[PDB]
Structures are given as structure tokens and as C-alpha cells.
Amino acid sequence: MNTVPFTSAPIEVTIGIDQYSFNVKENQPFHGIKDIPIGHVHVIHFQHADNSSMRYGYWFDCRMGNFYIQYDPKDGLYKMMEERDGAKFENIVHNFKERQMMVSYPKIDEDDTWYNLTEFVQMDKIRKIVRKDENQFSYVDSSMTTVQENELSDPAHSLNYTVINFKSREAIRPGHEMEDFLDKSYYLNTVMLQGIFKNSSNYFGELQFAFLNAMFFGNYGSSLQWHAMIELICSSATVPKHMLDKLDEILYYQIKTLPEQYSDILLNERVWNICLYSSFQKNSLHNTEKIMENKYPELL
Amino acid sequence: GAMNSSNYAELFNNDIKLFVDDTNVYRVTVHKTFEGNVATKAINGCIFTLNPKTGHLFLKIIHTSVWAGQKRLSQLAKWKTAEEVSALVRSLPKEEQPKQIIVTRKAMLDPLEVHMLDFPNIAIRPTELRLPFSAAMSIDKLSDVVMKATEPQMVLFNIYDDWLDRISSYTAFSRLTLLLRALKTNEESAKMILLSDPTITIKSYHLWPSFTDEQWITIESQMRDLILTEYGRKYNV
Incomplete structure (x- = not known):
């Protein structure tokens, strides 16, 4: 100790x-x-x-x-x-x-x-x-701003989160425009997991770090990164079963810990509604959906 | 951002731009099956891609074969439109490529943006304007080339015929939108007004009749009257 x-x-x-x-x-x-x-x-x-x-x-x-x-x-x-x-x-x-x-x-x-x-x-x-x-x-x-927030300004004092952009050449293979835009599995599994993160543990580590910076510092770019990493998984039709089960546990503890009074600034209505109710994984996050519905039914 | 009444003159400046209207891409007839269920039969469609300055219309005919064995056709239709517009841009010489593409329906923004990622300097814009380009298939010669197509085909028209010899693009676009608005509100009445005098014909190489400047004023007034009569019916006002 x-x-x-x-x-x-x-x-x-x-x-x-x-x-x-x-x-x-x-x-x-x-x-x-x-x-x-x-x-x-x-x-x-x-x-x-x-x-x-x-x-x-x-x-x-x-x-x-x-x-x-x-x-x-x-x-x-x-x-x-x-x-x-x-x-x-x-x-x-x-x-x-x-x-x-x-x-x-x-x-x-x-x-x-x-x-x-x-x-x-x-x-x-x-x-x-x-x-x-x-x-x-x-x-x-x-x-502190993120590398992504700075593209759209002191590079030394930036959060170098992995840039995720759903309307980018990285996210969309030439000739698979509709397929890759509506099903982000390519972007999640080949580009991000195999290509950049190497494994789901590094991806979850970044997601968890982004959440904690959002919660503890009200860091806006971190909150954007946390939602983007959730949305990339929920918007993929093909995700390893262990990643979905782990994501549900991760998000459950994040929602459980969030101060009730910061739900309005820390949770993106669009991303959460889409992830729990419209996405491919709408039925894969049982724990998260239950805690969100019982704790923040207004947002949904 | 969005194209509206405030920035209307922008259509007729010297920056190449195209309107894209996807409303006639996926067309169906709804019918009863033998068993009394309902089914659709697709008919040939078209992408309406128009330079409002020049009148150059890039009519991409969408043959029913493109839907065979596909699901979620109304969604696919937006992506096929964006694919065909992106293909058209890549087929044009650089100095002919648009600096802006304005989509008549906001559901075309993401599909076109994703298909045009290779062209980051081409602005993809919505419009607040309610443009009557859906009525393109009320122009007999455009309807005829679409319905007769046996395969995917691009056909090039000037939708202003030779009007730009006598009038500005601004006025040519105003005439076109008034003609299409009339054709959209009451097709039968609009076509009656356009052909009621048999002495005025459509040249083989034209879409609309060969009206003199005075005859266009009369026609334009008849189209406005048509639109107001119809509006007084719709609304009981």
C-alpha cells in the first residue's frame, strides 16, 4: 500500500x-x-x-x-x-x-x-x-484538447487519443462505401483492432481512460472519444462475443459511477439512444441498458 | 452550408455546381398478388443531375436490373445515386468537375459525402429550396428515354433548349422551376397549356416548344394561374 x-x-x-x-x-x-x-x-x-x-x-x-x-x-x-x-x-x-x-x-x-x-x-x-x-x-x-479537436492548437499539451472518424478514407474502403458506412465492422476489426490497437485490451484501455478524463476533469474531447469508441463497436454487425460481454461490464460501471447530476453534460443522447435501441448491438448490452433505463430514463 | 432564398444568385455565378435529385431513382408500382398480399414491381428510374448555369442535364438512367436480388431498395437507391454521381464527377475533366453539389433531399448528404471522400474540395450541400425536379419524368422525351432503356445508360440533355441565347441563367432556371412546379401540381393541365396551339412545335433536338419571347410570357402566366387555381383547391382558400 x-x-x-x-x-x-x-x-x-x-x-x-x-x-x-x-x-x-x-x-x-x-x-x-x-x-x-x-x-x-x-x-x-x-x-x-x-x-x-x-x-x-x-x-x-x-x-x-x-x-x-x-x-x-x-x-x-x-x-x-x-x-x-x-x-x-x-x-x-x-x-x-x-x-x-x-x-x-x-x-x-x-x-x-x-x-x-x-x-x-x-x-x-x-x-x-x-x-x-x-x-x-x-x-x-x-x-486540454485532443489531436482530433486540433485538426478541426499547442501540440505538446494535447490528448493523443486514436482518431476515429466515420466519414474518413480510413473508415471506408473504396467500393464498399455503403457497406462500411452502415456496418463499421471493417473499421473496428481490421483498421482499429488488428491495425492500430493490436488487441481489444488496448482499445478498452483507451475507452476507459477517455471516460475517466471526461468524468474527473469535464474534459470535452475525452467525452467525444469515449462516445466514438462505444459507437464504433455498437455500429459494427461483427464483434467478438467476449468484446461485447466485456463492453457491457465496462459501460455498466461507468454509468453506475457517473454523478447523477452530470448525466446532462457527460452523456450524448444520440449515441446512447442509437447504441441501446437502433444499433446492431442494441440487444447485446443487457447490464448497461438496464442501469441506463433505471438511472437516466430522461436521456432515453 | 444550406442553399436558400438568401443565396439564390449563387446558382448563376461562375463556380461549376450541380443539383442532384434522387426522387425518380427507385420507382415502383404497388399491386395485389394472387393470394391478395401486396407486392411492388420496380420500373426504370433516373438520377437528375443538373448544372443550373448551363442547363446541362446528366440523366443517368437506372435500369430495374440494378435492384435484382437487393434488399432495402429505398436505402440502396441513395447509395447507388451517390455512386453514379461520384462516377460522373471522376469521368469529367478536372476543369469541368463541380466545386459544389447541392442535393435536393437531406438523406443524400451522407451517401454522397462518403462516395466523394476522394474530392475533399467539392462541397456537398443541402438546400431549403423546394425544387420540383421530381416532375422531370413529366417531360415526355425524358420519360421516353428512361422507360425504353434496356440497360444502364447516361443521356445528356440541355434542359433549357436554346433559351440561354435570349435570357440569363437566372431567368432560364425560374422558367424551368415554374414549368416543373406546374407539371408537378397538375400534369394534364400543364401539358395542355404547353401543346394546346399545334403551330408551336418541339424541335427534334429540344425538350420544350419553340415559343417566341411573347408566347413564353403568355405560357408563364398560364402556368402561374394553374399553380394558384390548384392551390385554392388543395387548401379551400
Whole structure:
């Protein structure tokens, strides 16, 4: 069980750790988060009490290094940093633990929610979507645009999600225009799965990462990417049975976790109505359709 | 974006453009079967592809053989239209390729966009205009070449005959849309007006009669009267 110490909390802030969140007061003796489960990616995220504009945060995996948070009063944010001195870090953590100045990652033993949201998400894939190769952790915020949003503007600060475009030469084989447009199986199975992702695990990892950026940062481009990856599967007549069964589980936990009060901005009516009620896979997402119908019947 | 009353002069500028109307591509007669069920029999159709500036009509005849063994024909008809328009564009020399194609029905946008991905600089546009191009099959010579076709065929017409010698494209298009609107509202009455005087004939190489400028004014008034009479019936006003 690993630890992300904080040097201090000089500004009042709501701190997120995965699906959990805590209010910290200006200059409160807060020195970080302990008992973080090993084996998963995590996200530590922030919303300043004085400017709720820019939710921002860091994707990290404690197996890859010793990470801490320190407020930078010049750039005006909480920054993640790596401590390369193992003994310095262990001594910082032991002191803060002994003084009980850390919040405990509040996982219920029964509760598989975070595993279920991050099942296919791997730090090495996050670091290819979020390019900052000198850090082992990845910064995301509310305002970062995607490579696709930028085509239609600072490339270094972009989310390099896989570009999905249903009306593109990549999506449509010459001479199979109607076939490929109405049945996206070619695009899903040959171009995306065999060609770019190599396997359904990488595809699901990107889908899950896009959802979590949408939910945790209100990142609009991430939400677009999450819906596009759902729609590409639901709009394919030919999908491996294991991919459909897994997609139903993935989406079920995403819908279960979504704040009820953000359904209006985070869920695309057209995509969801099409996926559950008109698409080839309209009858393949039993769990998702049941939770959507019981939780968000207005949207449908 | 969409073509409307506000940007109407754009039709007659020097940017090559084509209207595409798919309303006569898939045509059927509905009939009773021996067992008293209903069935359709397809008849020959056509794509109506028109340069509104020049009058050049690219009438692609759609032979019933293209539907044999196919499902969801009304959906296929949009994709076959888009395939044939894309083929026509690729067949034209670059300097003759349109910069815009305006579809008369919004259901043609995605099929045409997907077929034209190779032509990213050709704008595919809808229109708010209610154009009466469905009535093309009320022009006797166009109906005749479609119904007689025994195979897929492209036939080239000038739908304005020689009008552009005397009038502007704007006026030629206005005349054409008024003629087609009349033919669409009351075909019998419209054709009576066009042929009632046997001294005015249709040249072998023309679609419409050889009216003098004064005779066109009379004809155009008779067509407007036809459209208003019919409208006062439809609506009881």
C-alpha cells in the first residue's frame, strides 16, 4: 500500500483520489494520501476553492516511482514530482504517518469499482496519449484538447487519443462505401483492432481512460472519444462475443459511477439512444441498458 | 452550408455546381398478388443531375436490373445515386468537375459525402429550396428515354433548349422551376397549356416548344394561374 505525500496545502482545494474526494482548508496540516492500492493506475485531482475553473490532476502508478505533491506558488497549482532518493522519501512518509497527517485511501473491501473502471488502463498507454516523457506520471486538465479537436492548437499539451472518424478514407474502403458506412465492422476489426490497437485490451484501455478524463476533469474531447469508441463497436454487425460481454461490464460501471447530476453534460443522447435501441448491438448490452433505463430514463 | 432564398444568385455565378435529385431513382408500382398480399414491381428510374448555369442535364438512367436480388431498395437507391454521381464527377475533366453539389433531399448528404471522400474540395450541400425536379419524368422525351432503356445508360440533355441565347441563367432556371412546379401540381393541365396551339412545335433536338419571347410570357402566366387555381383547391382558400 503506497503513499503520495504532500509538502503542504497552502491553498484551499478539493482533492480527488480516484472516485473519492476530500476538502482541504488553506494551510490545513495535510501531508497526503496513504494506503493507495498497488496494482492499479490512480488519478490525484484538484479543484481550487477560489477558482473551480481548471479541474486538473495526475495519472500515476506507485510501482513506477515515489511521487509527491508540492504547491508551486508561481504556476499556482499542485504539482506532482518524483523523489529519486528512496531513503529521503521513506523518512518523509514515516514522519507524516506517525503524526497522522495523511488521509487513508478509503477503499471498502467488497468494492471493485476502481478495478472495474481501470481494468484495461495501463500507465504505459496513458503516457502515449499524454506526451511528457521526462515524467512517469501524466498531467490532464479540463481544457486540454485532443489531436482530433486540433485538426478541426499547442501540440505538446494535447490528448493523443486514436482518431476515429466515420466519414474518413480510413473508415471506408473504396467500393464498399455503403457497406462500411452502415456496418463499421471493417473499421473496428481490421483498421482499429488488428491495425492500430493490436488487441481489444488496448482499445478498452483507451475507452476507459477517455471516460475517466471526461468524468474527473469535464474534459470535452475525452467525452467525444469515449462516445466514438462505444459507437464504433455498437455500429459494427461483427464483434467478438467476449468484446461485447466485456463492453457491457465496462459501460455498466461507468454509468453506475457517473454523478447523477452530470448525466446532462457527460452523456450524448444520440449515441446512447442509437447504441441501446437502433444499433446492431442494441440487444447485446443487457447490464448497461438496464442501469441506463433505471438511472437516466430522461436521456432515453 | 444550406442553399436558400438568401443565396439564390449563387446558382448563376461562375463556380461549376450541380443539383442532384434522387426522387425518380427507385420507382415502383404497388399491386395485389394472387393470394391478395401486396407486392411492388420496380420500373426504370433516373438520377437528375443538373448544372443550373448551363442547363446541362446528366440523366443517368437506372435500369430495374440494378435492384435484382437487393434488399432495402429505398436505402440502396441513395447509395447507388451517390455512386453514379461520384462516377460522373471522376469521368469529367478536372476543369469541368463541380466545386459544389447541392442535393435536393437531406438523406443524400451522407451517401454522397462518403462516395466523394476522394474530392475533399467539392462541397456537398443541402438546400431549403423546394425544387420540383421530381416532375422531370413529366417531360415526355425524358420519360421516353428512361422507360425504353434496356440497360444502364447516361443521356445528356440541355434542359433549357436554346433559351440561354435570349435570357440569363437566372431567368432560364425560374422558367424551368415554374414549368416543373406546374407539371408537378397538375400534369394534364400543364401539358395542355404547353401543346394546346399545334403551330408551336418541339424541335427534334429540344425538350420544350419553340415559343417566341411573347408566347413564353403568355405560357408563364398560364402556368402561374394553374399553380394558384390548384392551390385554392388543395387548401379551400
